[PDB]
Amino acid sequence: GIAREDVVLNRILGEGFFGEVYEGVYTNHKGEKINVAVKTCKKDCTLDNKEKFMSEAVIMKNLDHPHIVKLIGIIEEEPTWIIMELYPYGELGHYLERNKNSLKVLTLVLYSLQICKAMAYLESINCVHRDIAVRNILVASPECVKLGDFGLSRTRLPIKWMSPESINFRRFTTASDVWMFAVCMWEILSFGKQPFFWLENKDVIGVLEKGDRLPKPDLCPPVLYTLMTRCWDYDPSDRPRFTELVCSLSDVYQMEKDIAM
Numbered sequence: 001g002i003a004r005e006d007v008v009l010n011r012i013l014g015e016g017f018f019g020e021v022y023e024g025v026y027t028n029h030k031g032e033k034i035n036v037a038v039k040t041c042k043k044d045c046t047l048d049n050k051e052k053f054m055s056e057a058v059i060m061k062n063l064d065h066p067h068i069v070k071l072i073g074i075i076e077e078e079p080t081w082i083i084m085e086l087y088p089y090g091e092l093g094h095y096l097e098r099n100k101n102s103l104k105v106l107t108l109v110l111y112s113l114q115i116c117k118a119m120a121y122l123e124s125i126n127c128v129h130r131d132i133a134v135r136n137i138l139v140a141s142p143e144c145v146k147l148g149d150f151g152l153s154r155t156r157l158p159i160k161w162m163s164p165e166s167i168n169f170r171r172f173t174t175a176s177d178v179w180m181f182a183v184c185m186w187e188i189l190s191f192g193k194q195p196f197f198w199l200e201n202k203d204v205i206g207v208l209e210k211g212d213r214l215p216k217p218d219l220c221p222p223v224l225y226t227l228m229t230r231c232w233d234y235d236p237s238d239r240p241r242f243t244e245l246v247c248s249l250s251d252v253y254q255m256e257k258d259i260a261m
């Protein structure tokens, strides 16, 4: 069990949905230093916001995966603190924008592949992620991204990222996560472009009903855009399960390192 004394804040990382996140340091019990990020709860509305905060904590306590943010410990007390590993590189959306020219599609696929395995894992443990989006994904290194911890489950709504069912009947299933995930693949492959930036929220469903979808992205192969295309099938039962995307992407990528002279 870790205690407040073991943590030393240094600055403000930003403002999360629940309140400031702080960069700090955490000394072991062997005496070792570890850069860290500390999730805190605003001036959180009564039960509602804190409960949502706790719910996230509890899930995170349980998860364990190379491509999910590393939870280091929790200070249940007051105010309660969630200590995550820090990833200096920051959000993928921005690392994407500031490295267009440097990044080789074999990398953009590698990212997608690791996000997918993170999802397959989550699916296995009965969890859903309500925020698979490039600004909610962290860059651990150049060859490694780590998914969120926020949207993690089982308002402001990524309508532009949600399946039709997710919109009409607020149904958030693992098949709607398959849809949301493909939208995140698009986002990577399109160097941080915002999905449907031309539309306003209130008209997305309409668009998809007509059968309109996000355009192939420049660097995206055809096998991949086709795979993405199935995840956007209006009929849930039609889209691929994670286990399958992890196989296909696992191919499109080992092929991608083949096509690599």
Ligand SMILES: CN(c1ccccc1CNc1nc(Nc2ccc3c(c2)CC(=O)N3)ncc1C(F)(F)F)S(C)(=O)=O
Pocket: 013, 014, 015, 016, 017, 020, 021, 037, 038, 039, 069, 070, 084, 085, 086, 087, 088, 089, 090, 091, 135, 136, 137, 138, 148, 149
């Ligand atoms: C900045 N914020 C943020 C935005 C998107 C995603 C993640 C975070 C902060 N959370 C984490 N942030 C990091 N590293 C990190 C992140 C964002 C930047 C930086 C580092 C440097 C920077 O300039 N932005 N390492 C681990 C986490 C962990 F493990 F908590 F999820 S905020 C404050 O909540 O708005």
